[PDB]
From a paper:
1, 4-Dihydroxy-2-naphthoyl-CoA (DHNA-CoA) synthase, also called MenB, is responsible for conversion of o-succinylbenzoyl-CoA to DHNA-CoA in the biosynthesis of both vitamin K1 and K2. It catalyzes a multiple-step intramolecular Claisen condensation reaction involving two high energy oxyanion intermediates and two keto-enol tautomerizations in the formation of a naphthenoid ring. The first crystal structure of DHNA-CoA synthase from Mycobacterium tuberculosis shows that it forms two eclipsed trimers organized in a homologous hexameric assembly, in which each monomer is comprised of an N-terminal spiral core domain and a C-terminal helical domain conforming to a canonical crotonase fold. In addition to observing the folding of the active-site loop into a well-defined structure as previously seen in the substrate analog complex structure, we have identified a significant reorientation of the C-terminal helix as an additional conformational change caused by the small molecule ligands.
Author numbering:
A (entry chain A), C (entry chain D): 1 to 275
B (entry chain C): 2 to 275
Write the structure that this text describes.
């Protein structure tokens, strides 16, 4: 596919083609671990994709293979910049800004697909989970390490994982910190499909296209609806927000706006009280 | 064996022993429901709810059709769809399947979807809200909303996610692909798969295993499962059953008699248990 | 492994070795059914394990094989002592005290692993479910019987089961009261791994050891986090409670304590308001 570069970053690469955007984590020397900068850039890129009216689907993946032949989606938080209370940015401030990225991916009204080749570990594992869909290469390796490396993600990393693979498997994943193959990840319900490494991107594009032929309004409403099963009032905000969006496309709704601007009482008398 | 219980235009309705059977009968539209179909379905389920002998309802689609094809339900009849809903005979737009969803979900009888061939769109959601699903090996499952300009962001989304998990639920809705009976079982939304010509017999077999159980235990469990999903509405069903059971106690009856006899109640004999 | 007896009980056995405790239900004549006393002792043992700072993992299992060659994890509430409103203890009081045990297993900040050989039925099934993890022998048999024997567990027995195997299977389990093999139990997501009968304990020990090499603080926080997806404010209590525990290890927190004891206003001016 004709990928065009959309913006230049230090830690990532960002492209667009038709209704598809592609974001690539580009720190293969650290198994694509994110440092605070990486997250800022990821945030910026996803935000860009959110703002682009032509983009309906974002493919997220890791740069590879590395000089050692190994693939990686993301290895999570860069431990070489970790200190007191978080990951230290260039200015000395401790951060856990991936939490903001998690929220953006989760709430943005575009479908996000993780394309996992090789390692999706730790925060990189949580990143794949929060994407709407996951397509794995048959060399993909999934797991958490928190309790081994002195961390934990007790937010979407735990609760949301449990809403994917159930409570028994979710706990196993976190407590033992083992590694799981692509086939195991699919069997437990956290990977949508598995393809050969050299077919990964093409599968991503194929899935993106099947989505891009759908109604954008139906898709955004559904995404909000799924979030509403998890995120209480925050979820209701997204779902009700879309109801308001749709209501702002009605004649009935516009009558209320015009009435105010024209400084007259609104006339809703023609509109029925449906069952 | 099956005795007809009431006559309808769009559906068929039978009863035998503790089992009722409701059949969507519009095979010319792959058993799509129009507002009338829903009214009749509602009426039939309500009837089944009211019948003290009925413990289990089997829900299925009429088939095979003249073209040899099977269908459970294809969802909302798009040929009667207009502004704001599906237009009934009287011109009023409706989404009354939402009421049917609620009745199936809340009624204290076990409802089993028997899916042969297509369970698509609103027909897919209908199978989901039934307590159990038994599929024929020719069954085909899927959503189409984002393709045909619709969506079910209620039980169609959230409840689906409580069955197959969030990853698969989203795939189902976003891509609108079709899934085989075997795939549907593997992902957790179908309870078992049998050959087409064994579907009804399997339904009857499952119904019978349920019919030999305590009706009180079953209704309490169904409410309990709903309570994990439906907040205060779910608590209403569950607490409601607690009240029903409390109205079978001597302690509870003392309170009633005391009021009717215009005297203060005496609960002093009853302990405050741990 | 060198198991040392830790305390004597009538209905159960209790051992400890390294960071592992083992609790065994010992009433094989009733397929390890629990009577009120059994629950009291189980509670006491788990509570002991909770109090022991060396113990990080508890293995729960049933005594066997029985004289008839049959294995059992637990067969649930002892129906021979069941009367009006509950299971009658030795003093005549009806009880459903297993509900308290369920809560202790679920909330205690140690990982609990059910090792299921043969029958895990009824309340014994629910007991396996509330344990964090389940390892089954390939002879394991799982199921509920409530609607057959005039009972039901509409608490963790229903809702939590549904958070493991999904709503369709959970309902099947309860409505039909069939039996399910170890392989079926794994396939539906309620068993973490299946091993041969004579490997069950060794697998338990192996899993326990992989957990015991992890950070205890990370593990307790994760366990609370998983409970928070299910138990509303009770879940928030456990999770927030751990946040308080961690806050009580900070210098910032200690300044507040010292200020009060020294009868002076606290000085938090040096501490930043992080993003
Ligand atoms: C699982 C691997 C993907 C690959 O193994 P492999 O053997 O193939 O290569 P390896 O030698 O281990 O690594 C390759 C090189 O890249 C480095 N590297 C790999 N992954 C990371 C990494 N994640 N961070 C820093 N460096 C990394 C390695 O150190 C090494 O560098 P080098 O020795 O050449 O100098 C492995 O490297 C590994 O164990 N990585 C560590 C995973 C990890 O512990 N992540 C942190 C847990 S917490 C997490 O991600 C996270 C993040 C944000 C959070 C925010 C709020 C709340 C919670 C958060 C959270 O839990
Ligand atoms: C996937 C099939 C099951 C069957 O394939 P097949 O190729 O074998 O059949 P087909 O080619 O369509 O031919 C069958 C005949 O039956 C008709 N038919 C089948 N299903 C429907 C139908 N649902 N409505 C109207 N006509 C239908 C076809 O038009 C056609 O008639 P013909 O062209 O020969 O004159 C396919 O036909 C199909 O996509 N049918 C339409 C499914 C559909 O998208 N329904 C609406 C989605 S939403 C829905 O049901 C719904 C309902 C209520 C809701 C309420 C609140 C919120 C959301 C709701 C909701 O999302
Ligand atoms: C699958 C078995 C579990 C095994 O069959 P098997 O044929 O191999 O053994 P079996 O011959 O039937 O039984 C062996 C001996 O142990 C006895 N036994 C086995 N299980 C139990 C048992 N659970 N209670 C009392 N006795 C039991 C048998 O009666 C028999 O006694 P014996 O004739 O030698 O004198 C079977 O024994 C059996 O179905 N046992 C009954 C299981 C059961 O119904 N438990 C009660 C469901 S409800 C429950 O556990 C429960 C508990 C607390 C709750 C608290 C709050 C809310 C709900 C609760 C709740 O639902
Ligand atoms: Cl981790
Ligand atoms: Cl649909
Ligand atoms: Cl039971």
């Amino acid at each position: 596919m004709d990928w065009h570069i959309a913006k230049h970053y230090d830690d990532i690469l960002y492209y667009k083609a038709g209704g598809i955007a592609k974001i690539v984590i580009n720190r293969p020397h650290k198994r694509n671990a994110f440092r605070p900068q990486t997250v800022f850039e990821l945030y910026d890129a996803f935000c860009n994709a959110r703002e682009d009216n032509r983009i309906g689907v974002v493919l997220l993946t890791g740069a590879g293979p590395h000089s050692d032949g190994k693939y990686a989606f993301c290895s999570g938080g860069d431990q070489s910049v970790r200190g007191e209370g978080g990951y230290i940015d260039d200015q000395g401030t401790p951060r856990l800004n991936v939490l903001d990225l998690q929220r953006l991916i989760r709430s943005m009204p575009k479908v996000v697909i993780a394309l996992v080749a090789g390692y999706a570990i730790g925060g990189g594992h949580v990143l794949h989970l929060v994407c709407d869909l996951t397509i794995a290469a048959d060399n993909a390796i999934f797991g958490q390490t928190g309790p081994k490396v002195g961390s934990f993600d007790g937010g979407f990393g735990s609760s949301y994982l449990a809403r994917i693979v159930g409570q028994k498997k979710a706990r196993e994943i976190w407590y033992l910190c083992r590694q799981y193959s692509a086939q195991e990840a699919e069997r437990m319900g956290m990977v949508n499909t598995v393809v050969p490494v050299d077919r990964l991107e093409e599968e991503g594009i194929q899935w993106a296209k099947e989505i891009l032929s759908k109604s954008p309004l139906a898709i955004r409403c559904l995404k909000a609806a799924f979030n509403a099963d998890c995120d209480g009032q925050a979820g209701l905000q997204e779902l009700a927000g879309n109801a308001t969006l749709l209501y702002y496309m009605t004649e009935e709704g516009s009558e209320g706006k015009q009435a105010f601007l024209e400084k007259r009482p609104p006339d809703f008398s023609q509109y029925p009280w449906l069952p």
